């Protein structure tokens, strides 16, 4: 049960152990490229709860995104820009999810989970081969990742009236004139 | 109230008799796949929430787990014999429990169940 | 529109689609319902003749 200990350790990001490790790894990532491949996840508890397996077809990619603003505010998060740049780099893979790893005063760092849809191990295995279907091409481009669902306001309740079932879809339904045959 | 471009967003329902025929053929299609079975699942009898509609009653989503057990229907068998099951709803009174138990019993009396293969 | 005009000028045959449906409209096989089903009748009319119920709802 090592992953429950790892989950509680990531809760205390300001502690001596975690802040020391996040310091020496922030320097290490800046010595490398903006987008590069990680052999293993740096946060194995977080990747595993997001759907990572040590199988042939799962890869992990590290990415920096420049933090700040454009006084205009971008409507998607910096995690979304991190996912789209990795997906452009690996066009044959599918973006499953992504997670925060490090944060600087100039860059935000993320690690992206990718799945190969043409690997036989992925295709023969149910509970992952939904990503092989062509409806899941470039989920990060269309806002189907975890950060995409938060930005589009897809939550139940009276506090998300304009954003459930699509904002532009709900606006269009409210602005067509419906004329029947017997008026 | 025509301050927007309503001319590019206007829906005319000339397919009203066409979609009625499409819906009736979709009902006929599921009567062909499930030939002796009904084309609908059995649904519980529930009371409408608000004080405006307390006196009136309507069909709910699915039968509760407790009223399914009191009628003698097992959980994993009810979807296989055409009974909708709602794990979210609760009984909260004996009046809602007794009406649905009697409804499940009347369905059992009229049921013909075929012996597997 | 321009593609539709291109077919009219061309000496290529019009590929007529047969009216195939995803779902069948009548029961099939060798069982009691398929032998007693009437194609010209409706769903309620057939279930009246069978003595069964079709819609369990309101």
């Amino acid at each position: 049960g090592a992953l429950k200990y790892l989950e509680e350790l990531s809760k205390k990001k300001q502690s001596d152990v975690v802040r020391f490790l996040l310091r020496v790894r922030c320097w290490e990532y800046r010595q490398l490229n903006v987008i590069h491949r990680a052999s293993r996840p740096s946060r194995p508890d977080k990747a595993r709860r997001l759907g990572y397996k040590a199988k042939q077809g799962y890869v992990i990619y590290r990415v920096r995104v420049r933090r700040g603003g454009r006084q205009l505010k971008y409507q998607r998060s910096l995690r979304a820009t991190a996912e789209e740049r990795v997906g452009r780099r690996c066009s044959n893979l599918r973006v499953l999810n992504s997670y925060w790893v490090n944060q600087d005063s100039t860059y935000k760092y993320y690690e992206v989970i990718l799945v190969d849809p043409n690997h036989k191990a992925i295709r023969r295995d149910p509970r992952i081969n939904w990503i092989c279907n062509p409806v899941h091409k470039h989920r990060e481009c269309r806002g189907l990742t975890s950060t995409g669902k938060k930005s589009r306001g897809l939550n139940k309740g009276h506090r998300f009236n304009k954003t459930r079932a699509g904002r532009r879809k709900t606006w269009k339904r409210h602005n067509t004139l419906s004329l029947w045959r017997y008026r | 109230h025509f301050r927007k471009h309503w001319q590019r967003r206007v829906r005319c329902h000339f397919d009203q008799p066409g979609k009625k025929v499409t819906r009736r053929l979709a009902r006929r299609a599921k009567a062909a796949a499930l030939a002796p079975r009904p084309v609908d699942k059995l649904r519980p009898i529930v009371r409408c929430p608000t004080v405006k509609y307390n006196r009136r009653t309507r069909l709910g989503r699915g039968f509760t787990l407790e009223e399914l057990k009191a009628a003698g229907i097992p959980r994993l068998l009810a979807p296989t014999i055409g009974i909708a099951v709602d794990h979210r709803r609760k009984n909260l009174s004996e009046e809602s429990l007794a009406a649905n138990v009697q409804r499940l019993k009347d369905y059992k009396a009229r049921l013909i169940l075929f012996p597997r293969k | 529109r321009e593609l539709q005009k291109r077919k009219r000028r061309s000496s290529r045959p019009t590929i007529r689609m047969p009216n195939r449906r995803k779902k069948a409209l009548n029961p099939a096989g060798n069982n009691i319902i398929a032998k007693s089903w009437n194609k010209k009748e409706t769903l309620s009319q057939n279930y009246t003749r069978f003595g069964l119920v079709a819609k369990l709802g309101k």
């Binding site: 149910p126 | 079975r37 014999i81 055409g82 049921l111 | 069964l52």
Partner: peptide
């Protein structure tokens, strides 16, 4: 299919039934 799905379909399949009028 998953073998947990196959076990559920093996022991509780969709049955054939009728309701009298």
């Amino acid at each position: 299919v998953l073998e947990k799905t196959k076990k559920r379909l093996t022991h509780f399949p969709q049955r054939k039934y009728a309701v009298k009028a």
